[PDB]
Symmetry: none
Subunit: 325 residues, 2 copies
């Protein structure tokens, strides 16, 4: 069957928790740049105490259903806000330093040099009488850290670098949030394919790396030259924020390719032994999420979330729920 044009044709719409849908839109709309989305965001936040029937009606009277990519197939996976063990001091197991934004690193705007490049950027640092690209992972991992933010297991740092946010737990129960601070500007390279052609095979990557500290595993993580820097702040127990800078609503937010999807957009997932046909807001991304019909559904931060997220690998048809002009 081809893709729907309206809410009537949308399989799952009638059974959707329309309150959760409407709250998902509210969770994310304020981040939106579009002006037609601003009016609707405004009315949504104003209008409270709607029951499920009202919420369903509000959404239907204010949005249009617009298939993405003509209704073509892509992929739904899911992720959760991970909680990692850390130390404030290095040992054999917690051998990788969590590193803050280096003071030498510059994101250089290119517009002052060439109008044709206004709003493009490069990242590097001064070395001698010139300016060079910031070192890659391997070369950063080779200079010791002056003032490391914490110490982690290498494979776990590596994976928190992919997510962009997490919570670290010291043995004394101090919870510290690690918040994305910047990047060395190198492109992300997923290490799974290279691990495949070497014959050593998502949770399995982690487990292999973990069983082979260090130089074995170190050498393969280094195939990803993209290094992510953090800042740390005491966890206030709230949901983490994602790329868009807003508290992620559990089960109701997706990570997207930002080159295809603006943050704050309202979407409908049609994915299919569980089934995901629900409205979500786009509020995050990840170094590996690429493509148009591609969404990574945020499951939450607890234990239940960790378990449900790993179950999701679904054929996805995606739709924008576009606010009416």
């Amino acid at each position: 069957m081809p893709a729907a044009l309206s809410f009537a044709g949308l399989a799952g719409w009638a059974e959707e928790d329309h309150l959760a849908a409407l709250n998902a839109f509210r969770a994310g709309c304020g981040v939106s740049k579009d002006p037609a989305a601003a009016r609707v965001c405004g009315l949504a936040k104003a209008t409270k105490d709607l029951d499920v029937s009202g919420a369903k009606a509000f959404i239907e009277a204010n949005f249009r259903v617009e298939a993405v990519d003509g209704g073509g197939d892509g992929l739904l996976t899911a992720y959760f806000a991970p909680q990692y063990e850390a130390r404030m001091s290095r040992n054999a197991e917690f051998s990788a330093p969590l590193r803050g934004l280096p003071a030498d690193l510059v994101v250089l705007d290119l517009g002052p040099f060439e109008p044709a490049l206004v709003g493009k950027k490069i990242t590097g640092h001064v070395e001698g009488s010139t300016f060079v690209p910031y070192p890659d992972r391997a070369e950063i991992e080779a200079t010791p850290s002056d003032k490391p933010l914490a110490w982690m297991r290498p494979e776990e740092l590596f994976f928190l670098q992919i997510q962009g946010s997490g919570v670290l737990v010291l043995p004394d129960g101090r919870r510290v949030r690690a918040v994305f601070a910047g990047t060395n500007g190198k492109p992300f390279v997923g290490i799974a394919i290279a691990m495949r052609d070497k014959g050593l095979l998502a949770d399995a990557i982690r487990t292999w790396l973990a069983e082979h500290r260090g130089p074995e595993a170190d050498a393969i993580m280094r195939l990803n030259p993209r290094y992510v820097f953090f800042r740390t702040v005491p966890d206030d127990g709230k949901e983490p924020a994602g790329a868009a800078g807003v508290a992620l609503p559990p089960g109701r937010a997706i990570a997207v390719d930002p080159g295809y999807h603006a943050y704050g957009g309202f979407y409908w997932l049609d994915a299919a032994f569980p089934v995901y046909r629900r409205a979500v807001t786009a509020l995050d991304t990840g170094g590996a999420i690429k493509g148009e019909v591609r969404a990574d559904l945020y499951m939450g931060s607890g234990a239940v979330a960790g378990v449900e997220a790993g179950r999701v690998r679904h054929t996805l048809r995606l739709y924008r729920l576009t606010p009416n002009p």
Copy 2:
């Protein structure tokens, strides 16, 4: 194909042709050419040279005899002085040590092939100063001093010969840029009640000083140079040998070796005021960035303004012949 069947070979000035080869051959890495070079350095008049050439080279078409392109070029020539004076008030500046040109590709593959120019300031990198800012920075070690409006034109042309009062000549060779784009001044001048290059040069010369400077400043681009002392009658080409006017070509060195002796048969001019045919023997002694292809020649017309006018009128369909020794 022989010298009898060479359209033009009858009328050719064979003396100059041989002096072209002699100019010339000494730079060749071809044993056969060396043989003939030494042989010609010993041995004349207009009839004796025709004979000498007809007995020592054989004519051979290039690329089967396919059609290519003849253009021409010249060496601009300017007076200069080794000390400033209000006439020769603009310094010819070398490549600053702090100036850097960055390939952007290594930073962001999407920007492969792009470049920016600037210098390190503190812990960042800033755009290089424009013309107006460079001209307002006193010259530490100028390479020479030039009339400003003439430096301005040298900067557009990329290279030229400089002549001092005591007859010493230096070649001014392009060294780099401050990375800003050229901005023409004709229309800014025209919309001011002040249209060709000579006409702009005249005006700028007569209003030399603050007035002229203010409008040259509308062009933010700035070109830097290096100088090589060059005291031949004419300047040296890429082959290291001095170039005989009207008798030397620039070529693609991927196809044609320096010192090679060639015959040009050019016709079908594309421009107004052009000589209808070029038919002559010339030597390969130079190259340039734009001279690409096998049947492709840039004839060197000499230095100075006359050579420059002639050069601009060459655009002809070319059949290229090598005169191979033995």
